[PDB]
Amino acid sequence: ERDCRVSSFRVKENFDKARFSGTWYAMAKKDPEGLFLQDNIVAEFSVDETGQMSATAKGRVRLLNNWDVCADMVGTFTDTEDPAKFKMKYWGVASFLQKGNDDHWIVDTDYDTYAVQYSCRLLNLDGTCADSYSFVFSRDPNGLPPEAQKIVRQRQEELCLARQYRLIVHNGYC
Ligand SMILES: CC1=C(/C=C/C(C)=C/C=C/C(C)=C/CO)C(C)(C)CCC1
């Protein structure tokens, strides 16, 4: 019945940059087109004294040569007039790691258990997203409570990304 246009997706009301600080463990993922981080993904969100948020992401990526680098990614976030929607500039500490600029939307979080991020890299002419990625973060390395799980699938369906996530392995590779 409802809207898959990106312009219509609801995000986190009055997103608190500081309450989202710290370690988030990626539990689930919806991959974009091309090369992306595979597994072992752990982000560290941070806010300095002026309200600027940054993050570091750690994760394993398989490069064409068939490398298995544990990428150390850095992202800085630019605020928009929506508190839960950011522009994220990112780069690897290694030169070979992918650099870019993506939207970063906090679709929902309760700050202490779960987060849902989304990024549409490209919009179709109808307003829907032709290439997106999404992550489901957990405060706990062992996942989400049945409770958090129900809300998170609700949100996935809302993002028109239901049934398009795969679980993330964490086996200490990095
Ligand atoms: C920086 C950053 C993030 C995104 C990282 C990406 C998109 C990395 C891609 C790396 C690639 C494609 C390497 C290829 O060799 C997420 C959203 C986790 C939040 C934390 C900060």
PDB file of C-alpha atoms and ligand atoms in Angstrom:
ATOM      1  CA  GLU A   1       0.000   0.000   0.000  1.00  0.00           C
ATOM      2  CA  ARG A   2       2.752   2.584   0.868  1.00  0.00           C
ATOM      3  CA  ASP A   3       5.553   4.682  -0.486  1.00  0.00           C
ATOM      4  CA  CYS A   4       8.855   3.517  -1.821  1.00  0.00           C
ATOM      5  CA  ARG A   5       9.873   7.015  -2.906  1.00  0.00           C
ATOM      6  CA  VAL A   6      12.943   8.150  -1.021  1.00  0.00           C
ATOM      7  CA  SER A   7      11.503  11.587  -0.479  1.00  0.00           C
ATOM      8  CA  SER A   8       8.731  10.013   1.545  1.00  0.00           C
ATOM      9  CA  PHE A   9      10.802   7.812   3.919  1.00  0.00           C
ATOM     10  CA  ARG A  10      10.433   8.883   7.517  1.00  0.00           C
ATOM     11  CA  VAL A  11      13.614   9.308   9.618  1.00  0.00           C
ATOM     12  CA  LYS A  12      14.521   9.606  13.338  1.00  0.00           C
ATOM     13  CA  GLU A  13      12.712  12.442  14.936  1.00  0.00           C
ATOM     14  CA  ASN A  14      14.986  14.849  16.762  1.00  0.00           C
ATOM     15  CA  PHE A  15      18.125  12.705  16.296  1.00  0.00           C
ATOM     16  CA  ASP A  16      20.565  13.283  19.177  1.00  0.00           C
ATOM     17  CA  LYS A  17      24.119  13.140  17.798  1.00  0.00           C
ATOM     18  CA  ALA A  18      25.664  12.602  21.167  1.00  0.00           C
ATOM     19  CA  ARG A  19      23.307   9.739  22.238  1.00  0.00           C
ATOM     20  CA  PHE A  20      24.282   7.807  19.139  1.00  0.00           C
ATOM     21  CA  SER A  21      28.020   8.037  20.059  1.00  0.00           C
ATOM     22  CA  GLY A  22      30.018   4.894  20.608  1.00  0.00           C
ATOM     23  CA  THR A  23      30.233   1.382  19.287  1.00  0.00           C
ATOM     24  CA  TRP A  24      27.691  -0.018  16.943  1.00  0.00           C
ATOM     25  CA  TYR A  25      27.983  -3.580  15.652  1.00  0.00           C
ATOM     26  CA  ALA A  26      26.534  -4.245  12.250  1.00  0.00           C
ATOM     27  CA  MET A  27      24.131  -7.221  12.462  1.00  0.00           C
ATOM     28  CA  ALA A  28      22.480  -7.110   9.080  1.00  0.00           C
ATOM     29  CA  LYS A  29      23.151  -5.466   5.738  1.00  0.00           C
ATOM     30  CA  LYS A  30      21.589  -4.586   2.423  1.00  0.00           C
ATOM     31  CA  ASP A  31      24.516  -4.178  -0.104  1.00  0.00           C
ATOM     32  CA  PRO A  32      24.719  -1.398  -2.801  1.00  0.00           C
ATOM     33  CA  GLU A  33      25.991  -1.963  -6.334  1.00  0.00           C
ATOM     34  CA  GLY A  34      29.648  -2.876  -6.656  1.00  0.00           C
ATOM     35  CA  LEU A  35      32.321  -3.174  -4.053  1.00  0.00           C
ATOM     36  CA  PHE A  36      31.358  -2.881  -0.367  1.00  0.00           C
ATOM     37  CA  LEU A  37      32.463  -4.158   3.090  1.00  0.00           C
ATOM     38  CA  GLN A  38      31.738  -7.844   3.593  1.00  0.00           C
ATOM     39  CA  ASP A  39      31.656  -8.667   7.275  1.00  0.00           C
ATOM     40  CA  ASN A  40      33.340  -8.006  10.597  1.00  0.00           C
ATOM     41  CA  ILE A  41      31.782  -4.518  10.532  1.00  0.00           C
ATOM     42  CA  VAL A  42      31.991  -2.332  13.613  1.00  0.00           C
ATOM     43  CA  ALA A  43      31.522   1.448  13.511  1.00  0.00           C
ATOM     44  CA  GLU A  44      32.540   3.953  16.222  1.00  0.00           C
ATOM     45  CA  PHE A  45      30.441   7.078  16.223  1.00  0.00           C
ATOM     46  CA  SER A  46      31.813  10.258  17.728  1.00  0.00           C
ATOM     47  CA  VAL A  47      30.776  13.938  18.190  1.00  0.00           C
ATOM     48  CA  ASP A  48      33.308  16.759  18.996  1.00  0.00           C
ATOM     49  CA  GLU A  49      32.623  19.953  21.058  1.00  0.00           C
ATOM     50  CA  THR A  50      31.078  21.884  18.120  1.00  0.00           C
ATOM     51  CA  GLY A  51      28.455  19.228  17.242  1.00  0.00           C
ATOM     52  CA  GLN A  52      30.451  17.719  14.329  1.00  0.00           C
ATOM     53  CA  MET A  53      29.946  13.965  14.079  1.00  0.00           C
ATOM     54  CA  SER A  54      32.553  11.606  12.677  1.00  0.00           C
ATOM     55  CA  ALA A  55      32.835   7.834  12.657  1.00  0.00           C
ATOM     56  CA  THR A  56      35.370   5.144  11.990  1.00  0.00           C
ATOM     57  CA  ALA A  57      34.315   1.855  10.441  1.00  0.00           C
ATOM     58  CA  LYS A  58      36.298  -1.326  10.524  1.00  0.00           C
ATOM     59  CA  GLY A  59      35.443  -4.255   8.204  1.00  0.00           C
ATOM     60  CA  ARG A  60      36.736  -6.916   5.814  1.00  0.00           C
ATOM     61  CA  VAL A  61      36.518  -6.189   2.046  1.00  0.00           C
ATOM     62  CA  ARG A  62      37.507  -8.500  -0.869  1.00  0.00           C
ATOM     63  CA  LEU A  63      39.551  -6.484  -3.392  1.00  0.00           C
ATOM     64  CA  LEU A  64      39.779  -7.711  -7.110  1.00  0.00           C
ATOM     65  CA  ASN A  65      43.222  -9.220  -6.689  1.00  0.00           C
ATOM     66  CA  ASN A  66      41.449 -11.239  -3.987  1.00  0.00           C
ATOM     67  CA  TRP A  67      42.869  -9.373  -1.073  1.00  0.00           C
ATOM     68  CA  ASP A  68      41.397  -9.578   2.285  1.00  0.00           C
ATOM     69  CA  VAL A  69      42.008  -6.263   3.776  1.00  0.00           C
ATOM     70  CA  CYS A  70      40.532  -5.176   7.004  1.00  0.00           C
ATOM     71  CA  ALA A  71      39.580  -1.668   5.930  1.00  0.00           C
ATOM     72  CA  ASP A  72      39.921   1.202   8.394  1.00  0.00           C
ATOM     73  CA  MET A  73      37.449   3.720   7.209  1.00  0.00           C
ATOM     74  CA  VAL A  74      36.918   7.263   8.375  1.00  0.00           C
ATOM     75  CA  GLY A  75      33.731   9.261   7.797  1.00  0.00           C
ATOM     76  CA  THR A  76      32.973  12.929   8.677  1.00  0.00           C
ATOM     77  CA  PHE A  77      29.258  14.072   8.649  1.00  0.00           C
ATOM     78  CA  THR A  78      27.747  17.293   7.405  1.00  0.00           C
ATOM     79  CA  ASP A  79      24.423  18.364   8.938  1.00  0.00           C
ATOM     80  CA  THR A  80      21.398  19.165   6.821  1.00  0.00           C
ATOM     81  CA  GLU A  81      18.152  20.864   7.799  1.00  0.00           C
ATOM     82  CA  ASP A  82      16.875  17.422   8.803  1.00  0.00           C
ATOM     83  CA  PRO A  83      18.614  16.281  12.052  1.00  0.00           C
ATOM     84  CA  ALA A  84      18.644  12.572  11.099  1.00  0.00           C
ATOM     85  CA  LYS A  85      19.959  13.077   7.453  1.00  0.00           C
ATOM     86  CA  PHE A  86      23.668  13.723   6.884  1.00  0.00           C
ATOM     87  CA  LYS A  87      26.103  13.921   3.981  1.00  0.00           C
ATOM     88  CA  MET A  88      29.056  11.661   4.722  1.00  0.00           C
ATOM     89  CA  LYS A  89      32.467  12.095   3.236  1.00  0.00           C
ATOM     90  CA  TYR A  90      34.526   8.959   3.629  1.00  0.00           C
ATOM     91  CA  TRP A  91      37.970   7.623   2.889  1.00  0.00           C
ATOM     92  CA  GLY A  92      40.198   4.732   3.934  1.00  0.00           C
ATOM     93  CA  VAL A  93      43.415   5.159   5.968  1.00  0.00           C
ATOM     94  CA  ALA A  94      44.974   3.221   3.060  1.00  0.00           C
ATOM     95  CA  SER A  95      45.056   4.968  -0.269  1.00  0.00           C
ATOM     96  CA  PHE A  96      43.542   2.044  -2.168  1.00  0.00           C
ATOM     97  CA  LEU A  97      40.351   2.109  -0.070  1.00  0.00           C
ATOM     98  CA  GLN A  98      37.285   3.681  -1.499  1.00  0.00           C
ATOM     99  CA  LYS A  99      36.685   7.402  -1.024  1.00  0.00           C
ATOM    100  CA  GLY A 100      33.238   8.988  -1.691  1.00  0.00           C
ATOM    101  CA  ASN A 101      30.372  11.111  -0.489  1.00  0.00           C
ATOM    102  CA  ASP A 102      27.027   9.424   0.428  1.00  0.00           C
ATOM    103  CA  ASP A 103      23.850  10.396   2.241  1.00  0.00           C
ATOM    104  CA  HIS A 104      23.591   8.949   5.735  1.00  0.00           C
ATOM    105  CA  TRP A 105      20.087   8.703   7.204  1.00  0.00           C
ATOM    106  CA  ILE A 106      19.343   7.444  10.732  1.00  0.00           C
ATOM    107  CA  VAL A 107      15.998   5.898   9.899  1.00  0.00           C
ATOM    108  CA  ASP A 108      15.493   4.768  13.531  1.00  0.00           C
ATOM    109  CA  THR A 109      17.417   4.031  16.683  1.00  0.00           C
ATOM    110  CA  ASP A 110      16.606   3.844  20.317  1.00  0.00           C
ATOM    111  CA  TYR A 111      20.251   4.836  21.045  1.00  0.00           C
ATOM    112  CA  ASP A 112      20.820   1.841  23.396  1.00  0.00           C
ATOM    113  CA  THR A 113      19.974  -1.288  21.428  1.00  0.00           C
ATOM    114  CA  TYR A 114      19.468  -0.729  17.747  1.00  0.00           C
ATOM    115  CA  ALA A 115      20.037   1.559  14.781  1.00  0.00           C
ATOM    116  CA  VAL A 116      18.806   1.481  11.157  1.00  0.00           C
ATOM    117  CA  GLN A 117      20.824   3.442   8.651  1.00  0.00           C
ATOM    118  CA  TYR A 118      20.024   3.922   4.907  1.00  0.00           C
ATOM    119  CA  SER A 119      21.714   5.526   1.965  1.00  0.00           C
ATOM    120  CA  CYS A 120      20.285   5.870  -1.531  1.00  0.00           C
ATOM    121  CA  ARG A 121      23.234   6.296  -3.923  1.00  0.00           C
ATOM    122  CA  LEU A 122      20.980   6.760  -6.932  1.00  0.00           C
ATOM    123  CA  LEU A 123      17.413   7.575  -7.565  1.00  0.00           C
ATOM    124  CA  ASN A 124      15.251   6.286 -10.277  1.00  0.00           C
ATOM    125  CA  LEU A 125      13.220   8.798 -12.264  1.00  0.00           C
ATOM    126  CA  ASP A 126      10.121   7.748 -10.272  1.00  0.00           C
ATOM    127  CA  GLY A 127      11.684   8.870  -7.012  1.00  0.00           C
ATOM    128  CA  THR A 128      12.500   5.410  -5.692  1.00  0.00           C
ATOM    129  CA  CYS A 129      16.084   4.284  -5.116  1.00  0.00           C
ATOM    130  CA  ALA A 130      17.977   2.509  -7.891  1.00  0.00           C
ATOM    131  CA  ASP A 131      20.999   1.689  -5.771  1.00  0.00           C
ATOM    132  CA  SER A 132      20.910   1.740  -1.968  1.00  0.00           C
ATOM    133  CA  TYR A 133      22.572   0.145   1.011  1.00  0.00           C
ATOM    134  CA  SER A 134      21.314  -0.224   4.607  1.00  0.00           C
ATOM    135  CA  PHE A 135      22.694  -1.412   7.936  1.00  0.00           C
ATOM    136  CA  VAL A 136      21.098  -2.705  11.082  1.00  0.00           C
ATOM    137  CA  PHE A 137      23.307  -1.878  14.050  1.00  0.00           C
ATOM    138  CA  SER A 138      23.280  -3.390  17.533  1.00  0.00           C
ATOM    139  CA  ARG A 139      24.854  -2.134  20.747  1.00  0.00           C
ATOM    140  CA  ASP A 140      25.491  -5.711  21.753  1.00  0.00           C
ATOM    141  CA  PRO A 141      27.830  -7.931  19.604  1.00  0.00           C
ATOM    142  CA  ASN A 142      25.339 -10.764  20.095  1.00  0.00           C
ATOM    143  CA  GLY A 143      22.446  -9.032  18.414  1.00  0.00           C
ATOM    144  CA  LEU A 144      19.020  -7.678  19.051  1.00  0.00           C
ATOM    145  CA  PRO A 145      16.283  -8.794  21.437  1.00  0.00           C
ATOM    146  CA  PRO A 146      13.100 -10.222  19.857  1.00  0.00           C
ATOM    147  CA  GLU A 147      11.581  -6.864  20.717  1.00  0.00           C
ATOM    148  CA  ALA A 148      14.132  -4.805  18.729  1.00  0.00           C
ATOM    149  CA  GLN A 149      13.920  -7.346  15.899  1.00  0.00           C
ATOM    150  CA  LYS A 150      10.159  -6.722  15.355  1.00  0.00           C
ATOM    151  CA  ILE A 151      10.719  -2.925  15.079  1.00  0.00           C
ATOM    152  CA  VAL A 152      13.739  -3.375  12.799  1.00  0.00           C
ATOM    153  CA  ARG A 153      11.701  -5.629  10.315  1.00  0.00           C
ATOM    154  CA  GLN A 154       8.886  -3.002  10.467  1.00  0.00           C
ATOM    155  CA  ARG A 155      11.433  -0.350   9.395  1.00  0.00           C
ATOM    156  CA  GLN A 156      12.909  -2.627   6.675  1.00  0.00           C
ATOM    157  CA  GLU A 157       9.500  -3.055   5.108  1.00  0.00           C
ATOM    158  CA  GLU A 158       9.066   0.782   5.389  1.00  0.00           C
ATOM    159  CA  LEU A 159      12.316   1.268   3.460  1.00  0.00           C
ATOM    160  CA  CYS A 160      11.100  -1.090   0.698  1.00  0.00           C
ATOM    161  CA  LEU A 161      14.079  -3.279   1.604  1.00  0.00           C
ATOM    162  CA  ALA A 162      12.256  -6.121   3.324  1.00  0.00           C
ATOM    163  CA  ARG A 163      13.759  -9.523   2.614  1.00  0.00           C
ATOM    164  CA  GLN A 164      16.915  -7.897   1.215  1.00  0.00           C
ATOM    165  CA  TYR A 165      19.243  -8.200   4.111  1.00  0.00           C
ATOM    166  CA  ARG A 166      21.850 -10.783   4.856  1.00  0.00           C
ATOM    167  CA  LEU A 167      23.378 -11.502   8.298  1.00  0.00           C
ATOM    168  CA  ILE A 168      26.980 -10.235   9.000  1.00  0.00           C
ATOM    169  CA  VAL A 169      29.738 -12.566  10.190  1.00  0.00           C
ATOM    170  CA  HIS A 170      31.905 -11.565  13.002  1.00  0.00           C
ATOM    171  CA  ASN A 171      34.793 -14.025  13.350  1.00  0.00           C
ATOM    172  CA  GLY A 172      37.574 -11.719  14.655  1.00  0.00           C
ATOM    173  CA  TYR A 173      39.223 -11.515  11.156  1.00  0.00           C
ATOM    174  CA  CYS A 174      40.108  -7.906  11.715  1.00  0.00           C
TER     175      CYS A 174
HETATM  176  C1  LIG B   1      32.926   5.311   6.943  1.00  0.00           C
HETATM  177  C2  LIG B   1      31.602   4.831   7.546  1.00  0.00           C
HETATM  178  C3  LIG B   1      30.704   3.931   6.981  1.00  0.00           C
HETATM  179  C4  LIG B   1      30.756   3.496   5.551  1.00  0.00           C
HETATM  180  C5  LIG B   1      31.786   2.831   4.982  1.00  0.00           C
HETATM  181  C6  LIG B   1      31.889   2.392   3.619  1.00  0.00           C
HETATM  182  C7  LIG B   1      30.732   2.738   2.658  1.00  0.00           C
HETATM  183  C8  LIG B   1      33.049   1.761   3.282  1.00  0.00           C
HETATM  184  C9  LIG B   1      33.388   1.164   2.006  1.00  0.00           C
HETATM  185  C10 LIG B   1      34.603   0.603   1.763  1.00  0.00           C
HETATM  186  C11 LIG B   1      34.975  -0.052   0.517  1.00  0.00           C
HETATM  187  C12 LIG B   1      33.900  -0.165  -0.613  1.00  0.00           C
HETATM  188  C13 LIG B   1      36.232  -0.546   0.380  1.00  0.00           C
HETATM  189  C14 LIG B   1      36.667  -1.200  -0.846  1.00  0.00           C
HETATM  190  O1  LIG B   1      37.969  -1.740  -1.024  1.00  0.00           O
HETATM  191  C15 LIG B   1      29.416   3.395   7.786  1.00  0.00           C
HETATM  192  C16 LIG B   1      28.108   3.607   6.984  1.00  0.00           C
HETATM  193  C17 LIG B   1      29.571   1.899   8.084  1.00  0.00           C
HETATM  194  C18 LIG B   1      29.283   4.161   9.110  1.00  0.00           C
HETATM  195  C19 LIG B   1      30.517   4.473   9.773  1.00  0.00           C
HETATM  196  C20 LIG B   1      31.418   5.374   8.946  1.00  0.00           C
END
